[PDB]
Amino acid sequence: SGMAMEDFVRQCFNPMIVELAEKAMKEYGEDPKIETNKFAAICTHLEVCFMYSDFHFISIIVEPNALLKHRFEIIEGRDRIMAWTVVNSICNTTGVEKPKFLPDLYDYKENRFIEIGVTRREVHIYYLEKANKIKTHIHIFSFTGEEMATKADYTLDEESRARIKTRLFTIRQEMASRSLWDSFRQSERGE
Ligand SMILES: O=C(O)C(=O)CC(=O)c1ccccc1
Ligand SMILES: [Mn+2]
Ligand SMILES: [Mn+2]
Numbered sequence: 001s002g003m004a005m006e007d008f009v010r011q012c013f014n015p016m017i018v019e020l021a022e023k024a025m026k027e028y029g030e031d032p033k034i035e036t037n038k039f040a041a042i043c044t045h046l047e048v049c050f051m052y053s054d055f056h057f058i059s060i061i062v063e064p065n066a067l068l069k070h071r072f073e074i075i076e077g078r079d080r081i082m083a084w085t086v087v088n089s090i091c092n093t094t095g096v097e098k099p100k101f102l103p104d105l106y107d108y109k110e111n112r113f114i115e116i117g118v119t120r121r122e123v124h125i126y127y128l129e130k131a132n133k134i135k136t137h138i139h140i141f142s143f144t145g146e147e148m149a150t151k152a153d154y155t156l157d158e159e160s161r162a163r164i165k166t167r168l169f170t171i172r173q174e175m176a177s178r179s180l181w182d183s184f185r186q187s188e189r190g191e
Contacts, residue, residue, distance in 0.1 A: 002033065002034060002035075002036040004178065004180060005036035005037060005039070005040060005180055005183075005184065006032065006033055006036045006039060008040070008174075008175065008178060008180060009021075009032075009036065009039050009040045009043055012040075012043070012171060012174065013043045013044075013046075013047060014047075017043050017046045017047055017050075018043060020046055020077050021039060021042040021043045021046060022039075024042055024077075025038070025039065025042065027079065037183070037184055037187040040184060041118070041188075044118055044168070044171065045076070045116070045118045046076065046077055047167065048116055048118050048141055048164055048167075048168070049074060049076045049077065049104050049105065049116055050074070051160075051163060051164045051167065052072065052105065052114075052116060052139075052156065052160075052164065053070070053071070053072040053074050053105060055160070056070070056071035056072060056156070056160075057069060057070060057071055058071055058108060058109055059071060059109045061157070061160075069108060070108075071107065071108055071109055072105045072106065072107055072108070072114075073086060073090060073105065073106040073108070074104075074105055075087060075102060075103055075104055075105060075106065075113075076104040076105070076116070080102070083102050084102070087099070087102070087103070087106075087113075090106045090113075094108075094111055096111055096112070096113070097135060099113055099135060099136050101133075101134060101136070103115050103136050104116040107137075107155060110137070110155065112135075112136070112137050113135075113136045113137065114136070114137050114138075114139060114155070115130060115134065115136050115137070115138045115139070116139055116140075116141070117130050117138065117139070117140035117141070118140070118141050118142075118143075118168070119140060119141075119142055119143070119188065120142070120143050120172075120184060120185040120188045121142075121185075121188055121190055121191065122142065123140050123141070123142040123146040123147065123148045124148055125190075125191075126140050126142075126190075127140045127148040129190070131150075137149070137150045137153070137155070138150050139154070139155060141164055141165060141168055142168070143168050143169065143171065143172040143185075144169065144172065145165045145166070145168065145169040146165070147161060147165060
């Protein structure tokens with residue numbers, strides 16, 4: 001029925017992530033109870049976008065004093081209007097070229113937008129498909145603990161990246177234990 005994946009998703013992710021994913025799905029005519037893999041992919045992509053942004057200020061790491069600037073602006077998880085409202089703001093502030101497609105983050109240290117990709121397939125092939133459908137720096141994470149980033153520029157320190165890669169390796173294993181991995185993987189478009 002999809003009950004099994006749906007319940008896994010609700011206990012895997014925190015309630016903010018879950019609410020945001022449900023919100024995104026209802027907005028576009030999608031029921032979280034029915035398209036349960038999508039439900040899991042939407043949550044996972046949010047968590048990675050938030051993990052990537054956590055703790056980073058200007059350029060230092062803090063786990064938060066009042067004069068610090070957040071290193072990253074977060075564009076994902078906002079409706080389209082708001083999403084574009086925020087990109088316009090960054091473009092006025094910084095003078096950066098406005099991208100043609102919505103990105104996921106803006107990095108105020110490097111002054112570039114970031115496309116974060118997450119895939120159950122292999123990391124390189126997915127990177128290449130994303131680089132073809134797009135200036136915007138791309139960074140892909142796989143569920144098996146890999147990443148690929150534009151020009152071998154990984155933006156963050158290794159410990160930060162290890163935290164996201166381990167988070168994702170762990171979701172795979174937890175799903176795998178429940179005999180849900182194989183079907184979650186297979187549902188992703190492409191080989
Ligand atoms: O797939 C991703 O990694 C996205 O980050 C997708 C995204 O934001 C989007 C924006 C406009 C239309 C459809 C997807
Ligand atoms: Mn996005
Ligand atoms: Mn993305």
